[PDB]
Amino acid sequence: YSATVDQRLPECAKLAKEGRLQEVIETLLSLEKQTRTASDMVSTSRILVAVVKMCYEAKEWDLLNENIMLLSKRRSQLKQAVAKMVQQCCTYVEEITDLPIKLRLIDTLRMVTEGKIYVEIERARLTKTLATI
Amino acid sequence: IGTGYDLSASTFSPDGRVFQVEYAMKAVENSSTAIGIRCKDGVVFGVEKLVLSKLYEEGSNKRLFNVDRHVGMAVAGLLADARSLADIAREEASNFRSNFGYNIPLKHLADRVAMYVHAYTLYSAVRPFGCSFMLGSYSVNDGAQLYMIDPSGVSYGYWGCAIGKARQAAKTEIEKLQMKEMTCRDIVKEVAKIIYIVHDEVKDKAFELELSWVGELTNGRHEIVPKDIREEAEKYAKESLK
Amino acid sequence: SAGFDRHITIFSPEGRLYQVEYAFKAINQGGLTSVAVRGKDCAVIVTQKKVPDKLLDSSTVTHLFKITENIGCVMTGMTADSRSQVQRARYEAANWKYKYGYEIPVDMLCKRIADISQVYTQNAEMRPLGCCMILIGIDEEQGPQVYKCDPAGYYCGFKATAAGVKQTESTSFLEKKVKKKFDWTFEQTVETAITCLSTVLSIDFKPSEIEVGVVTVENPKFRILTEAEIDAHLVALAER
Amino acid sequence: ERGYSFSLTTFSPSGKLVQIEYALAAVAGGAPSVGIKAANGVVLATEKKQKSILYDERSVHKVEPITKHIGLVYSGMGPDYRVLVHRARKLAQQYYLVYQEPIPTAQLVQRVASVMQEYTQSGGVRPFGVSLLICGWNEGRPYLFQSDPSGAYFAWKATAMGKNYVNGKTFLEKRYNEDLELEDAIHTAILTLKESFEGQMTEDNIEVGICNEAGFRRLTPTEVKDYLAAIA
Amino acid sequence: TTIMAVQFDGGVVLGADSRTTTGSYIANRVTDKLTPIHDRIFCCRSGSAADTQAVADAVTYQLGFHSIELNEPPLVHTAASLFKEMCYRYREDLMAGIIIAGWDPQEGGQVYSVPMGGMMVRQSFAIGGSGSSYIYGYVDATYREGMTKEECLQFTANALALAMERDGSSGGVIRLAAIAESGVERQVLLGDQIP
Amino acid sequence: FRNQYDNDVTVWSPQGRIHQIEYAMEAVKQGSATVGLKSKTHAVLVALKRAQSELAAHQKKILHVDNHIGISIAGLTADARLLCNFMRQECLDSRFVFDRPLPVSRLVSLIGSKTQIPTQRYGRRPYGVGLLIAGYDDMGPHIFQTCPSANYFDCRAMSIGARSQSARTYLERHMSEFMECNLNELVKHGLRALRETLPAEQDLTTKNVSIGIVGKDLEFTIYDDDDVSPFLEGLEERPQ
C-alpha cells in the first residue's frame, strides 16, 4: 500500500507527465479509499499531496475541484489530509496571478471549508489574499 | 451490593440485572472444572472430580451423564441441581422421541432445556438452576455440536468450553490448542493434559479424571472412555505433564 | 418518595411503576445495540456482534431470528429472555395460523405479544421478560411494517427504530436521516442502517461483526443476509 | 400512613386504599383527553404527540370502537388501555350474543367498571392505571361516561382528564352549554386540546372520534385537518 | 377414494380422485385429497374428510413449529410420526387413512402410510380408500421398479383410470404432485389426458 | 442482618451458596453416629442407638424397607420416616410392575430427585436426614450415603452424624481390609468404628448398638440386644 504508492510515485509521476486524468484519478481514488479505511499515517499524506500536485501542475481547476468535492463528500477523511490539501491550494493560489482562476479557486476554498481545522490560520492567509482581491 | 433487590429472582436492579442469576454464576465459578472438545467426527467430555474422601468409591457422583443414546451430559455446579436438570432433560428427550419419532437434535434439545431452565429463572416461588451443563452429540446427517448452558439461561454454541474455578485459565490453555481437524484419538490427549494442568495441587488436591465421548468411534453413541484408552490417556498425561 | 421499587404490582406515589423502568434499563444490560430501517418495499434489520473468543460457534450466536416463513425478528437484552420471547412469539404465530387460517400480520403479532407482556407486568407472578423486540414483515394493501415491543407491553410501529446501549443517539441519527424525506431504496435502507451503527459506535466495523435480515415485497420470505451479500453491501458502502 | 400504601387489601386508618389513589395519580399523568356530549351526539379527542416522527402514528389508535355505536378513549397507560378494550369488546359481545340486541352503553360501562374493579379485589394484581371515557348514543340520547381504575363510573356532560386536566376542566365549564351542536362540540374539544397541547397540533398530532345517531366513527385524518384549519 | 402414491428416485408422485359423497348423492366432485402440509412434504387423505382436514391443520401447525425452531425443513419420518400419534390417540374415534408422501434432503423421496387404525409404515406404492381394493391386483401386475417422472405419471394415470372406471367412489378429476430437490410440481389430469 | 440470605431455600448468598441447604446439611451432624461397611458379598449397617432416658427404649436407627435393601437414618424423625414410607412404596411398586428388586443406584437416584424438589421449590423444608443405604444387586453390595443437600455418594464406608469424624478417620486408617473381610470381621470393624465415635465413659452395650447386615443370599436383617449378642461375643475389648 505504502509500498505500492512509493514504487508508484515514479511510475505515477512518469504517467502524470502525460496528463491522462481519468485512469490516474481512478487508481489514486482506490488507494486513498483503502488508506482511509485502514487509517494510515504517511501514505495518505503522500497520495493526497500527489493528486493535488498533479492537478495543479497539469493546470486543471475542475479536476482539483472534483478532488476537493469528492473527498469532502467522501467520508472517513483524515482532518490533517484536508488541511494539507487546502493549505497546498492556498500556496497554489496566492502565487498565481490569474484573476479569474484566483477568484474561482478562492470560491472553491470557501465552499470546501465548512468544519474549520487547525490550519485555519493558513486559510486566514488565503482569506487575506481574498481581502486584497 | 443490591440489598433489598436480590431476595427474589423477579426483582430487577437499579442497573437492571437480576442478582439471583449472577449469584448462580458465582456458585458455578466456585464449582469444579469440566472441559469438552468436539472432534471431527464426534465430541468428547472431561470431568475433574475431587475425591473429597478416599472413603468414597470410584465412580461416585458420576458427572458425565448421557441424556440420550447420542447425547451426553457434562455439568458443573450442584450435584443435586445436576441430577434434577439431567432428569428433566432426559424426560424432554423421551417426550421428543415419543411425539416426533426420531433422535433429538442437540440444538433443539439445548433450546428446550434452556427454555425450561429459564422458566425457573424468572419466577419468585422457585430458584434458577445454579448449575452449568454441557450438551454434546454426533449425528451422521447433521454433524457435531457443542453447547454450554449456564443458570443465566443462555445456550450459546462453543467449539469447546470450560466451566468452573479455572474458566479463564482453561480458556487461555485451550486457545493454544488447534481443534477443528484432529479426531477423538488426537483430542483425548489434549483434554487429559488440559485437565491435569488446570487443577491446583497445593490447594484442592485429590482429584481423579473421568472422560466420556460420543461419535462414530462408538457408532454415534455416548459412553465413558474405555479403560484401555483411559489408561492410555492417563499415560500420555503423566508423560506430558512431566 | 422511594421504596416502592420492589414489586412489579406496586404503584409508587405519582403513579410511577419503578420495576418496569428497571426492566427497561435491563434491556440495555445486554451491552449490544440494534437498529431497524424500512423502505418503500423493504425493511432492514442489523445488529452488532461481540465475540469474547474464537472458541464459540458463530453460526449459533445469531441475534436475529424468524418468527414465521415471512415474519422475521430481531431483539436484544438478556439472551435467555430473548429466546423465551421468540419461542412464545413463534407459538403465538403458529396458534394464530391454526385458528384463523392465514399468516399473522406484524401489527397483530406485536399486539398479542405485547398483551402477553402486559399481563406479565399486571400480575406479580411473572418477571416481565426484560428484552425488547423488533418485528418486520410485509402485508398486502399496507406494505412493509416495522414494529417494536418492550417488556411493558407497549407496542408501536416505526419508520425506523433502535435499541441497546446506544438507544438515544441511534434514534437521534435516525431522525436526522428521516427528516430529509428520501425514498430509502433497499440498498439505501441497508446502508443507512450500517452507517447508523458505525457512527453511533465509532468503530467502522469489519463485515464479520454484523448480522442483517431483510424482508421485501418481491422476497416476502425473511431472508437472513448471508456473509456474501452483507460483504457486498457494506464493502460497497465502504467504497460508495 | 406509609405501611398502608403498599397493598390493596388493607384499609388506611383514616381514609381508604392508597394504591387506588396512586393508580389515579398514574392516570392524571397520561395523555390529555377531552370528551364532550352535544345535543345530537358526542365527541372525544386526545393528543397523539410523540417524539421521533419515526414512530408510525397510524400503527396504534387511542380511540377505538367497542361496537357499532360505542367508542372509548383513555388517559394513562397504553397496554392497560388495550387490555381494557379487549375485555370491553368481549363483554359487549357476550351481551349481544345473550340478548341479540346492541348493548346499551350504561350496561357496558357498568360491566367494564366491574371488570376493572375486579383487579382491585385482591393483592398481587395492580389496578389498571387507566381511566376510560365512554361515548354512546341510544334511545335518542347521547351518553358520556367515565370509568375509573377504582371501578367507579359516573356520567359527564363534558370532561377532560390526563395531563393538565384541571385547566381543561375549567375551560370546558367556561365553554360548554347544554344546547351545543356537534360541530361546535368538536370545535370546543379541539380548543380544549389546544390550550395545553404545547406544540401546534397537526392533523395526526391529535386523534378525535365522534358518535351520533349513525353510530360511532373515529374521524379520518382529512376531516381532522379540515376541522383544525377551520379552528385555525 | 383412490389415493395411490409411489416414490421414485428423486421423489414421490401422489394421485387421487375427486369424489366426495354423503350417501348415494355426490356432494362435491372437485375434491382434492392432496393437501400441502409444507413446502416439500405433502399428504394423501382417505376416510372421513373432516378428520383428515383437522389432523392436517394440526400437523401443519406442529411441523411448522418444528421447521421454524430448527430453521430446517422437517424430515418425512417426523411428520409420519405426528400423523401416527394423532391417529392412534384418536383411533377409537378417528375414521381416516393418511398417506404421508414427500421429499426431504436427509434421505430423499419417502412414502409413509398410516391406514385405518394407525400403522406407521413405509412402502413403494401407498393406495388408500374404498377404491384401493380394486387396483391392488392391477398395480401388482403393473408394478415395476424405478419409474421415471414420465413413467410414474403413466403409472398413476392408468392405475387411477382403472380405479375411476371400475369404482363408483372415485370420480371427478385426478390430481398429481411431484416432490423433489428442484421443488414441488403439481399437475392435474382431465379430459382426454386420463387414459 | 447480613444473614437475610438464610430464611428460605430459594435465595442465594452473595458468594453463591444456599445457606438454608448448608444448615440442613449441618442438621444431620446433630444425630447420633452411624457407620456402614461392605464386603465382597455382604454389606453391614451398624448404628449407635440413643434413648431419651434410661427408663425408656433406645431410638431405632436402622430401618427395613425391603428384603434386599435397607436404610439407616440420622437426623429428623419426621423427614426420615417420610423418606422411609416413600422408599417402601417405591420398592413395592418396582416389585409389582417389574418383579425385580429396585436397584440401589436407581433407588438412590429417585431419592435424590425426590429430595431435590424441596431444595429447589418454595414450600417443603429440605429433607434434613442423612441416609445410609446398603443393598445388593447384580454387581454386588453397595453403600450409598444421601446427604441432606439432596446429594448422594457411592462410598466404601461413611459415618454421618455426631462426632462421625472419628469413625471417618478410623475407616481412613482401615481401608485395607474392608474388601476381603467376611461377616464377623466387617462387623467387628464397624463396632470398633462406633467405639471410636463413643467417648471413654461409654461403651457399646447390647441396648446401645444396632446392626443391620445384607448380602447376596442373606436378606437385610437387623439385630438387637439378644441378636447382637453372638456378634459382640466375637468383639474384642476397647484399646483403652
Report how far residue A16's alpha carbon sits from residue A6's, in angstroms, rounded to the nearest whole number. Answer: 15
Q: Is B108 on the interface with E (CB under 8 A)?
A: yes
| Residue D91, C-beta contacts closer than 8 angstroms, at least 6 positions apart | D108, D111, D112, D115
DSSP state letters, C44-55: EEEEE---S-TT
Cα–Cα distance for residue pair B200/B186, rounded to 1 Å: 25
Please say if E148 is a catalytic residue.
Answer: no
* Residue in chain C lying closest to B115 (CA): C84
Looking up cell 428433566 gives: B88
Catalytic pick from E1, E2, E31, E60?
A: E1
Among E11, E1, E10, CA closest to E101? E11
Number of neighbouring beta carbons within 10 Å of residue F98: 9
Distance from CA of C143 to the nearest CA of B (A): 33
Q: Is A97 on the interface with C (CB under 8 A)?
A: no
Nearest-CA distance from F16 to chain B in Å? 4
Q: Residue A80 has which C-alpha cell?
A: 490533517
**How many Å apart are CA C85 and CA C150, to the nearest integer?**
11
Q: Which domain holds residue F85?
A: 3-236
Instruction: For residues A86 and D24, give the distance between their C-alpha atoms in angstroms, rounded to a whole number.
Output: 64
Give the nearest partner residue to B156 out of C5, C24, C56, using CB atoms: C56
Residue D179 neighbours by CB distance under 10 Å: 7
What's the one-letter identity of residue F122? Y
C-alpha cell at D13: 386508618
Q: Are E6 and E147 in contact (CB under 8 A)?
A: yes
Angle (nearest 5°) at CA F190 between F186 and F192:
115
Task: Please tell me if residue B129 touches chain F, with a CB cutoff of 8 Å.
Answer: yes
Chain C CB contacts of D59 under 8 Å are: 107, 145, 147, 156-158
Cα torsion F26, F31, F32, F34: sign: negative
Query: Who among B9, B61, B126 is closest to F153 (CB)?
Result: B61
CB C148 within 8 A of CB C161: yes
Q: Which of residues 41 through 60 in chain E touch C, CB cutoff 8 A?
A: 57-58, 60
CB contact under 8 A, C59 and B107: no
Q: In the β-sheet with F140-147, what is the strand arrangement from edge to edge?
A: F62-64, F69-75, F129-137, F140-147, F151-154
- Neighbour count for residue F158 (Cβ, 10 Å): 24
Question: Which residue in F63, F21, F47 sits closest to F147, CA to CA?
Answer: F21
CATH architecture of D2-231: 4-Layer Sandwich (3.60)
Tell whether D80 lies on the interface with C, counting CB pairs under 8 A.
yes
E69 touching B, CB under 8 A?
Answer: yes
Considering only CB atoms, F12 lies closest to which of B27, B55, B57, namely B27
Nearest to F149 by CA among F122, F131, F127, F117: F127
Any CB–CB contact under 8 A between D41 and chain C?
Answer: no
User: How far apart are the C-alpha atoms of E89 and E113, rounded to whole Å?
Assistant: 17
Distance CA A125, CA F212 (A): 107
- Distance (Å, rounded) from C-alpha D5 to C-alpha D22? 9
Size of interface B-F (CB pairs under 8 A): 103
Residue F81 CB coordination number (10 Å):
13
What is D153-211 written as a DSSP string?
EEE-SEEEESTTHHHHHHHHHTT--TT--HHHHHHHHHHHHHHTT-S---TTTEEEEEE
Nearest alpha carbon to residue F60 among F173, F192, F208, F181: F208
Helix extents (H) in F70-216: 77-97, 104-120, 164-173, 183-197
- Contact across the interface for B102 and E85, Cβ inside 8 Å: no
The answer to whether F49 and F58 are in contact (CB under 8 A) is yes
Q: What CA–CA distances, in Å, run from A68 to A29, A81, A130, B66, E86? A: 12, 11, 19, 67, 72
Chain D residues within 8 A of C171 when measuring between CB atoms: 52, 54
- What distance in Å separates the CA atoms of residue D61 and residue B191, rounded to the nearest whole number? 61
Q: Distance of CA B57 to CAs B45, B204, C151, F154, Å?
A: 21, 19, 50, 5
**Cα(C113)–Cα(C135) distance, integer angstroms:** 11
For residues E101 and E43, is the Cβ–Cβ distance under 8 A?
yes
The separation between the first and the last C-alpha atoms of chain C, rounded to the nearest angstrom, is 54
Strands C160-164 and C33-38, bridge-based pairing: antiparallel
**Which residues on chain C are in Cβ contact (under 8 Å) with D149?**
none
d(CA E99, CA E120): 10
Residues of B whose CB is below 8 A from F155: 53, 55-57, 60
CA angle C76, C81, C83 (to 5 degrees): 85
The region, left, alpha or beta by phi > 0 then psi within -120 to 50, assigned to residue C81 is alpha
- Given CB atoms, is C119 within the 8 Å cutoff of chain A? no
Number of structural domains found in chain C: 1
B175 chain-C contacts, CB cut-off 8 A: 53-55
β-partners of residue B143 are B139
Q: Which domain holds residue C112?
A: 1-240
**What is the C-alpha to C-alpha distance for residues A47 and A6, in angstroms, rounded to an integer?**
9
Do residues F42 and F214 make contact, with C-beta atoms less than 8 angstroms apart?
yes
What backbone phi and psi angles, to 5 degrees, belong to E32? -110, 120
Residue D76: strand, helix, or coil = strand
SS3 C111: helix
Q: How many Cα neighbours within 13 Å face the side chain of C80?
A: 25
Q: Which three cell numbers stand for residue B72?
A: 451426553
Are the beta carbons of C33 and C201 closer than 8 angstroms? Answer: yes
Residue whose C-alpha cell reads 370528551 in the numeric block: D35
Q: What is the C-alpha separation between C221 and D134, in angstroms, rounded?
A: 42
Pick from C22, C59, C87: which is nearest to B16 by CB?
C22
Q: Looking at the partner chain, which of C66, C69, C94 has a beta carbon nearest the beta carbon of E65?
A: C94
CB contact under 8 A, B56 and F154: yes
Best residue of E70, E87, E89, E121 to probe chain B, by most B CBs closer than 10 Å: E70
Quote the CA–CA distance of B185 and B172 in Å, as a whole number: 22
> Distance of CA E90 to CAs B97, E46, E122, E134, Å?
19, 16, 21, 28
Instruction: Look up residue E132 and give its DSSP letter.
Output: G
The one-character DSSP state at B214 is: E
Phi, psi of D215, deg, nearest 5: 80, -170
**Please, which residues have CB within 8 angstroms of residue D107's CB and are 6 or more apart in sequence?**
D95
Q: What is the three-class DSSP state of B70? A: coil
User: Cell digits for D35?
Assistant: 370528551
Query: What domains, with CATH codes, occur in chain B?
Result: 1-240 (3.60.20.10)
d(CA B64, CA B35): 11
* Ramachandran class of D151: left when φ > 0, alpha when ψ lies in -120 to 50, beta otherwise: left
> CA-CA distance, D226 to D203, in Å (whole number)?
8
CATH value at residue F72? 3.60.20.10
Residues counted in chain B: 242
CA distance C45 to C64: 8
Identify the helix (H) or strand (E) that includes residue D25: helix D18-28
Is A33 part of the contact surface with chain C (CB cutoff 8 Å)? yes
Q: Are strands B132-139 and B143-149 parallel, antiparallel or unpaired?
A: antiparallel
Q: Are B46 and B32 in contact (CB under 8 A)?
A: no
Give every strand in the sheet of B223-224, ordered side by side: B162-163, B34-39, B42-50, B207-215, B223-224
CATH of residue C232's domain is 3.60.20.10
Q: Domains in chain E and their CATH numbers?
A: 1-195 (3.60.20.10)
Task: Report the domain count for chain F.
Answer: 1
Contact C121 D127 (CB under 8 A): no
Listed by start position, the domains of chain D span 2-231
Cα–Cα dist F21/F119, whole Å: 7
- Cell numbers that stand for F96 in this block: 409389582
Tell me the C-alpha distance between B153 and B128, whole Å: 9
Is B139 an 8 Å CB contact of chain E?
Answer: no
Q: How far is B185 from chain F (nearest CA, A)?
A: 30
Residues of D in contact with C5 (CB under 8 A): none
Distance, in Å, from the CA atom of C102 to the CA atom of C100, rounded to the nearest integer, reads 6
In chain C, after which residues is the C-to-N distance over 2.5 Å, breaking the chain? none
C124 touching D (Cβ < 8 Å): yes
DSSP secondary structure code for residue F121 in this structure: B
> Nearest chain B Cα to C4, which residue?
B4
Question: Distance from E75 to chain C by nearest Cα, in Å?
Answer: 17
Report how far residue F60's alpha carbon sits from residue E35's, in angstroms, rounded to the nearest whole number: 70
Distance from C-alpha of D35 to C-alpha of D23, rounded to nearest angstrom: 21
- Sign for the pseudo-dihedral over CA of A69, A72, A73, A75: positive
Coil, strand or helix at B91: helix
Mutation choice for B interface testing from E65, E81, E120 by most B CBs within 10 A: E81
Neighbours of D8 (CB within 10 A): 21
CA-based nearest distance E191→chain C, Å: 33
Q: Residue D87: is it exposed, middle or buried by C-beta count within 10 angstroms (0-12/13-18/19+)?
A: middle
Pairing mode, if any, of strands D206-212 and D215-218?
Answer: antiparallel
C140 min Cα distance to partner chain A (Å): 39
CB nearest C90 (choices: E58, E60, E69): E69
Closest to C131 (Cα-Cα) out of B117, B153, B126: B153
| Residue of chain D minimizing CA distance to C108 | D59
Q: Which residue has the cell 340486541?
A: D101
Residue A39 has a CB neighbour count (10 Å cut-off) of 10
Whether E63 and chain B come into contact, CB under 8 Å, resolves to no
DSSP 8-state assignment for residue B52? S
**Total residue length of chain E:** 195
Q: Which residues pair with F48 in a beta bridge?
A: F209
CA distance B195 to chain C (A): 17
A38 contacts in C (CB within 8 Å)?
none
Amino acid in the structure at residue F131: L
Which chain C residues are closer than 8 Å to D79 by Cβ? Answer: 114-115, 117-118, 121, 152-154
Out of C9, C17, C156, the one facing D60 most closely (by C-beta) is C156
* CA angle (D112 as vertex; D110, D118 as ends), nearest 5: 105
Question: Residue C105 carries which DSSP code?
Answer: P
Q: Contact B100/E106, CB-based, under 8 Å?
A: no
Contacts of residue F42, defined as CB under 8 A and 6 or more positions apart, other chains included, come to F141, F182, F183, F186, F213, F214, F215, F216, F218
The 3-state DSSP class for residue F103 equals: coil
Let me know: does D130 contact D69? Beta carbons within 8 Å: no
Looking at CA atoms only, how far is residue C127 from chain D in angstroms? Answer: 13
Q: Measured between alpha carbons, how far is residue F167 from residues C8, D187, E138, F32 in Å?
A: 53, 94, 84, 12
Place of cell 432416658: F53
User: Which residues in chain A are closer than 8 Å to C201, comparing Cβ atoms?
Assistant: none
For residue E30, count other CB atoms closer than 10 A to its CB.
9
Calpha distance D174→D184 (Å, rounded) = 14
CB D173 within 8 A of CB D49: no
Cα F11 from chain centroid?
29
